[PDB]
Design a protein around this motif. Structure first.
Motif, PDB file in Angstrom:
ATOM      1  N   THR A 197       4.782  10.630  -8.666  1.00 55.67           N
ATOM      2  CA  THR A 197       4.147   9.117  -6.718  1.00 55.67           C
ATOM      3  C   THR A 197       4.389   7.892  -8.430  1.00 55.67           C
ATOM      4  N   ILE A 198       4.837   7.116  -7.531  1.00 55.84           N
ATOM      5  CA  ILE A 198       4.171   5.909  -8.130  1.00 55.84           C
ATOM      6  C   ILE A 198       3.147   5.052  -6.761  1.00 55.84           C
ATOM      7  N   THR A 199       1.870   4.766  -7.197  1.00 61.02           N
ATOM      8  CA  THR A 199       0.687   3.877  -6.065  1.00 61.02           C
ATOM      9  C   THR A 199       1.534   3.167  -6.477  1.00 61.02           C
ATOM     10  N   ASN A 239       7.039   8.736  -3.814  1.00 61.95           N
ATOM     11  CA  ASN A 239       7.165   9.907  -4.457  1.00 61.95           C
ATOM     12  C   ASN A 239       9.030   9.468  -4.577  1.00 61.95           C
ATOM     13  N   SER A 290      -1.739   4.462 -14.381  1.00 66.29           N
ATOM     14  CA  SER A 290      -1.799   4.580 -12.765  1.00 66.29           C
ATOM     15  C   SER A 290      -0.629   5.813 -12.917  1.00 66.29           C
ATOM     16  N   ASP A 291      -1.041   7.069 -12.237  1.00 67.45           N
ATOM     17  CA  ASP A 291      -0.258   8.649 -12.398  1.00 67.45           C
ATOM     18  C   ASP A 291       0.719   8.402 -13.298  1.00 67.45           C
ATOM     19  N   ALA A 302       0.025   0.246  -4.471  1.00 65.76           N
ATOM     20  CA  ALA A 302      -1.939  -0.389  -4.865  1.00 65.76           C
ATOM     21  C   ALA A 302      -1.920  -0.842  -6.481  1.00 65.76           C
ATOM     22  N   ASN A 303      -1.729   0.013  -6.793  1.00 72.12           N
ATOM     23  CA  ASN A 303      -2.133  -0.152  -8.355  1.00 72.12           C
ATOM     24  C   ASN A 303      -1.839  -0.778  -8.885  1.00 72.12           C
ATOM     25  N   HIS A 304      -0.714  -1.168  -8.731  1.00 71.01           N
ATOM     26  CA  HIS A 304       0.380  -1.880  -9.594  1.00 71.01           C
ATOM     27  C   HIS A 304       0.007  -3.679  -8.494  1.00 71.01           C
ATOM     28  N   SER A 358       0.237  -1.190   0.020  1.00 69.94           N
ATOM     29  CA  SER A 358      -0.115   0.412   0.155  1.00 69.94           C
ATOM     30  C   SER A 358       1.291   0.756  -0.204  1.00 69.94           C
ATOM     31  N   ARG A 359       1.359   1.050  -0.423  1.00 66.92           N
ATOM     32  CA  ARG A 359       3.082   1.889   0.396  1.00 66.92           C
ATOM     33  C   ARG A 359       2.301   3.637  -1.194  1.00 66.92           C
ATOM     34  N   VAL A 360       2.803   4.397  -0.729  1.00 64.27           N
ATOM     35  CA  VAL A 360       2.801   5.126  -1.819  1.00 64.27           C
ATOM     36  C   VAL A 360       4.311   6.422  -2.017  1.00 64.27           C
TER      37      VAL A 360
END
Length: 184
Positions: free
Chosen positions: A142-144, A52, A100-101, A146-148, A48-50
């Motif tokens: 940003t790399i979200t 940057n 994503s992002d 959780a989306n991946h 779940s890490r966001v």
């Protein structure tokens, strides 16, 4: 959630100079490398890490990658979210896409047979998200994750239960180059 971990791994081929700078910042210069993985992030990854980062420089002369990168165990998986690359765009077996992002990423699987890993010579799996075009360099990105993670799950690409490190990595293969990156 600022960074807590610095990685400076090389196979010792050619010259790789990596600097552990203040906070989330690092740099690396390399000439005629074999393989190396240098970067900053967290000693225990999270799905779940966001993350940057801002790559002040990412200038491979030949093959290098700039990615969210990490490992799980049980099972052993090496994973990537590749935002930038040099001469070579990494691929594997196509599974689908994730958006994503601001980027659209191709999703790949691959097997590495008796190959180098976090546990030495092992047969393991790679999960990839590879941006369809190179992301901007010198921008706050940003790399979200959780989306991946959730896109990968939808294709049966389930990560292992034991999390190893998770970094914004500069990786080179038989190349030269420079990078300077700040992670948070």
């Amino acid at each position: 959630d600022t960074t807590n971990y610095w990685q400076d791994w090389t196979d010792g081929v050619g010259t790789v100079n990596a600097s552990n700078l203040a906070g989330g910042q690092y740099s690396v210069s390399w000439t005629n490398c074999g393989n190396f993985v240098v970067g900053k992030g967290w000693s225990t990854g999270s799905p779940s890490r966001v993350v940057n980062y801002n790559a002040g420089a990412f200038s491979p002369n030949g093959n290098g990658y700039l990615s969210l990168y990490g490992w799980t165990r049980s099972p052993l998986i090496e994973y990537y979210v590749v935002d930038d690359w040099g001469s070579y765009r990494p691929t594997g077996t196509y599974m689908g896409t994730v958006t994503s992002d601001g980027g659209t990423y191709d999703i790949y699987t691959a097997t590495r047979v008796n190959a180098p890993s976090i546990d030495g010579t092992q047969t393991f799996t790679q999960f990839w998200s590879v941006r369809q075009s190179k992301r901007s360099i010198g921008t706050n990105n940003t790399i979200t994750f959780a989306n991946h993670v959730n896109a990968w799950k939808s294709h049966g690409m389930n990560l292992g239960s034991s999390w190893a490190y998770q970094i914004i990595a500069t990786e080179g293969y038989q190349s030269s180059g420079y990078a300077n990156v700040t992670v948070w």
